[model samples]
Structure formats: structure tokens, C-alpha cells
Target: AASIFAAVPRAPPVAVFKLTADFREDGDSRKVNLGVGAYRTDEGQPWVLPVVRKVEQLIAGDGSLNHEYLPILGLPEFRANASRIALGDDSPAIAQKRVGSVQGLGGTGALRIGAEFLRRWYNGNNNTATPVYVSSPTWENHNSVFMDAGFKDIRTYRYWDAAKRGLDLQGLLDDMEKAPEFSIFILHACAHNPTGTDPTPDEWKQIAAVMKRRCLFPFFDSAYQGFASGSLDKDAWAVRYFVSEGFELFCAQSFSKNFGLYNERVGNLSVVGKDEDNVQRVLSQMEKIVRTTWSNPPSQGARIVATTLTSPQLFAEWKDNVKTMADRVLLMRSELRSRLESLGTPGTWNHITDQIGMFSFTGLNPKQVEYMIKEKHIYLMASGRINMCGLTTKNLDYVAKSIHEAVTKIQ
Candidate 1:
């Protein structure tokens, strides 16, 4: 009567989800969850973008819309439009028919697909195992995703400078130079997760040069394109720049954050090849992966995204909504830093304002995080990463004060 699953051990709970569950069970009105990255309204609730809501209504009412399966590569219009957003409208690759794109589950799924594709086909020399390099402090799931995609040589490159609380440009360049030629390196397209720090335009140019010289393949994970700077093009500068450099690269585009299509799992994996024939060959392989995996991506999310991207009015509204969210997160950063300074909190807090996007690495240690959670009902990753959108006008002061106390009292 012994069960076959008796030897299986329970997996450890995901950190963010565990924190969210604890926050829900707690009756404390002041409890806050800053662990997740989804956009939140100023009222501290999950926000559905007005543009998304409008599109949903239109799609729901349209009699033509059906539950039919999408193509193996997904909706043609969605993939095409998604590539344009990631790469540029005037991108020579797109015009040259060198871009192959496919709809994926989300940013994570897109990255996974891209990783598997590279693992199978891009292994240099056809005998050596190609290593995939990620930032030292990247998204928690990055290592797992690439690992599951069949890459055994997953590694890290120095990215964050703890002493300066900024990017380690020299260290990053050196590491890239030392990596095996043609190895895959994952680049955060914009609004780097956990750290919220990114390279300047000049730094990007230098990095690109090193990557080019080293013949390293770039794989961009664009989870926060419009969500980063509010301007889609501005956030996509890095990816577009790489494309302009004539480097054939891979990019994973996620609409979950920008389009508020989180549960719908909207994403695209774009592969840039040398020419039309090359792109076609690459795409055929990707389609094979998709066919065996999900068969085809869902239709509802892709249809809504296509509708918004194609419509001038809806696209304009969506851009404005993105701006509003970015502005709010920026304001929260300013307010939190100002409050900490006013309270005469120990240590410099300028990094709070310096970091951009939804998350901020507050430089708080694990002890300080534990103190805040137990004493102030504030939930955040032990790495000190907090979703800036989690801060609201009603609770900004409390959150700031709790952060101040954690730093000053924990020591």
C-alpha cells in the first residue's frame, strides 16, 4: 500500500508567495506586501489599466471573437506588433525579414523558450557546452528557468557594486571579456529587477562593444519595457541599439506588466538572424518547441494585445497609463527618501531615489528585513528589494518609518 510518491519531499515555498500568504492571514491593517512586482494603484490594490479594461470590453462584445486555438507561433498580428515594440519600427532586421517571433506564456516562458533554443542550436563548436551568464543578483527564477531549459553551465557576472550601491561597469566588462566566445549572456532590457539600476547610455555602448568584441550572444529579457520609463521606445533603447549594431540576438518581450495582462500570460520571444532564410530556419525550430509544449498560445490575451497595439487611440491611452504608473513609483521613491532623511535615519539613503522602476534595493540586510516584518508588519525580500508601487500615500510614512527603524535599531 506504500505510495509511489512517498519518497518525494515537499518543495520550499517561493519567497514572494510565502510572504503574500502571511500578509493575507495576518489581521493587521498596517500589513503591507512589497515582495511581488505587479503594478499597484496608489490605493494599494492591484490595478487593471483602463486601456486593458476597454479592450477587454470590446473583445468580449465582439461576436467574431471565439475560443479557437491560435497558430503554433501564436497570433500573427501580436507577434509582429510585439517585435516592433521590442526592436524598433524602423529596425532594419524587421524590414530585412531577419526577425522570428513567437507568442509565449509570459516573460519567464519567453526566456525559457529562448534558452532552450540557444542550448540546442547555438552551442559553439558543436562539442563544447556553452555557458549562460546572468547578473550576480538577477531575478530569483532566472537560474531555475535556464537550468530547466537544459543548460548546465549557468553562471553569474558581477553586476551590482555593493560598496557604491550602483552598477559595477568595470567588473561586468571584464567578466564578459573573459567568458567563452559565443556564450549566451542574459541582459535585463530595462528597469533591472531587484536592484532597479541600469547602465547609462555610454555604459551601454561600452558593454555592447565588449559583447561584440567577445562575440557573446545577447539574450534580452524585457519584462518592463513601457513600465520602466513610461515611454516604450525609451525603455527599449538597449535592445534597439543592439539590433542597430547588426548583432543577431534574442529578446523576450513580456506584456504582463505594461499591458496589465498578468494572468493572461502574454509574451513574445523574438530571434534576430542574419537573413530571411536564417530567420525562417530559427523560427521553424522554435515552432517545433511550441508545438510540443503548449501546442499554441492562448488566443484571448494575444487578441487583446493585438487590438491595443494596432489601434491608435487605445495605444495612446495605454502609453499615458504607463506614464502614470511610472510617475507614481518615482514619486514614492522621492517621498520615501525624503522621509528617511527628515527622520535623521542612519546611513545614506540616496540610492532610494537613484534606483528606478517598480522595485528598489533598499540596502537593508536580512536582519533588518526580519525586524521590519516582525515589528512593523512590513513584508519584503531579505535582499532588501521592495516593490515601490507597494507604497501608497496612506502608508508611505509608516513604511518609511519602519525602514528607518529597521536600519537604525537592527544594528
Candidate 2:
């Protein structure tokens, strides 16, 4: 190693992971970890969907399965199945062959690949840098991803209003309309991370119309599809709406949440262009990007997802599992709210149930979170977002009592 290149300093540990590790080491039996985004069973164990296990068994029985290197674009069967899952089988883009799909190393990799593609292809200005419009409080890594991908300007729109605990709709629309033409806007397809809030269908129609009129480029990060609504088609409404509006954009699809295949890193990055020929060109560019980067994606998760989607029986079983997880999360939301209310926790806790997905931004400030950790052994993100799935039957009463104390005992 060259001595001249040794100036880089060692960085601190990741906040989320570090915090979760600390929780793991704690001896307190009543401690709760509502920090991670993974699905947990009612018993608080990491859940692998029953359907995923069945698919694994089928693959194990096949002696032909081998340790083979995939092409840069990855397995064709996985990509094709991914397309139908995201855009529906009859999507106009799929029907016209105007969509380019490639498997990547799960959601994060897919996002990074798309960012790299845009940095090279869609610089919005001659001299100035192209801007990526993300929500004011988007997934923490989004800004860094685009910046590292070579984009110059990273911008944000008003997304959540903490006071009302709801979307800042007017401010959001105004910013989208005012952003530079041909700007890249990142959207969470459904069950927006951290906040767990989503726009209604009518609201989405308005957002899409504005983007169409402004000629802005849409880039979607869809990490939670069926995991959000337990209905794949319902969760994909926004991206599909944009596709129908003739917008040329890209999507990053992740199977991590729904399939419970976190370590597997199975995902797809796709581009939808104006026409069939444009689709081929876009995909070609994606292939080039993938070739230069990691070369190709892993195969285990891809095979598992592919087998499940192709087999009618497994597909149905997977659907049922999706519903089970979603329903369990919904049950947790109800239980948490009911318990909080029963204890007379001040303010309306209804938002906990109203918010969808694995998280609820409880609007608890840092002081309250710290107090809970110090006194009650309940741990949540300092920003107030808690993983709702972490609530289990055994801990619900304790968690509710702790939350109530944190809320009422505070000044």
C-alpha cells in the first residue's frame, strides 16, 4: 500500500446495525428491538415464507442445478418473471417489448445501477449537473447513492409534515412542478420506508399528470411490493400509471422483503422507454453497466424466486403467505394502538394503525426514545420510526406500557 494514499480515516459503524447489535447483547428479557426492517414472526424470529421453503425443496431435488455463472443480464427466466410481477403480464410496455429488465444484487444494487445509468445518459444541463429529486426524508442512503453514481445535484421535495403526521401534498406538488425540466425524481413505489405512508390512487394520478406535463424523468425504488399491501398489483399502481402515461423511466425491484430472501440479494433493474426499439437500446445500456460493475448477479435467490413464480401451486401458496405477513403486521398495528389508548397515552395513536407496512414513525423525539432505552428497555430508531413487526404477543403489553410511560412521563 502506498503511504501517500493512507489519509482516509476509519468510519464509525452503521447506526441501524450497531444499535440492533447492542440490543442483541443486552441481557434484559423485556427489551424490544423495533429498529430493523425485516419481517418477524409473532414469536419474534426472522420469518422465511413457507412458499420460499417449498421452492427451495423443489430446487434441491433437481440434480441438474449447478454452480454456474450467470450472464451480465442474469437469468432470462427470472427477468421475465420479474417483469410480470412488477408491471403485470399485460403491461403495455411488456406487450410492446419496450421494457429492459436485468437481475442485480437485490434492491440496493438495482438502485445503484440505475443511478449510474442516469449519470452517464441523462445529464439535464450542458454545463450544470443533473438533479435527482428525492423526498425530504427519503431512505437515508438514496442521496449518497445518486451522488456516488456521478450525479451532481441532489435535491428534495417536502414529503412528510410531522405536525399533522401526513403528506405535505401541496408542497410536494409545487416542488415537483418547479424542479428543472427533465429532472430525475425518485419515488417509493409503495409502503414508503420509515414513514410507512403512501399516496391514494387519485393523488397518484395527479402526481403522474404533473410529471407528464413537466417532462420529468421518473425513477422508482420498489423494495416493498407485495410486502406492502399483500397485493402485488395494488402496490405497483404508481409505476404502472406512469408507464401508461408514456413516460420513459426506470424501476428497481427487490424480492428481499416479500420473499424473505434478504441474504440472497435477488433483484431486477429495468427501464421503460417510449417504444419497443427504445426499450432494446435502454436495456443494452443497462447490460453494459452491469458488465463493467459486478459482472453478474448471484443465482440461488433468482432460482428460488423463478421456481416459485413459474409453478402455479407455489405461486398461490406465496400469495397466501404474503397475505399472512401483511395481516400479521396489520394485527400488530391494531394491538399497539389499542393498548396505547387503553393506557391513556396522550394524543391520537390512530396513525399507528393507519400507517401501512413494517414501520410507523411514532413522531417520538430523541429524548423520549432515549428515556425508553434507559428506563424501559424498549429500543426504537432515534428518529422515532419503529419496526411494527417487532411487536409480538408476548411483548405487546410490556411495549405498550413502556410507550405509555414514555409519552405521559415526559415533560
Report the CA-based lDDT of candidate 1 relative to the real structure.
0.89
Candidate 2 local Cα displacement, residue 125, angstroms: 9.0
Give Cα distance to truth, residue 136, candidate 1, Å: 1.0
Best by lDDT: 1
**Residue-wise C-alpha lDDT for candidate 2, range 1-411, written one tens digit per residue:** 678759989898877888789899989878888887989999999988899888888888999878888888999899999978999998999888888888989998999888887777665323238778999788888988888887778999889988888888999999998998888899999998889988889998989988889888889999988877789999999989989988888899999998999999999987888887877776788889988899888899999999899989999999999989998999899999999998888888878987888889898878899988878778788888999889999999998888887877773
| 220-316: candidate 1 lDDT, tens digit per residue | 9999998887788899999999999989999998999888889999999999988999889988888898888888898888888999989999989
Off by over 4 Å in 2: 1-6, 124-128
TM-score of 2: 0.96
- TM-score of every candidate relative to the true structure: 0.98, 0.96
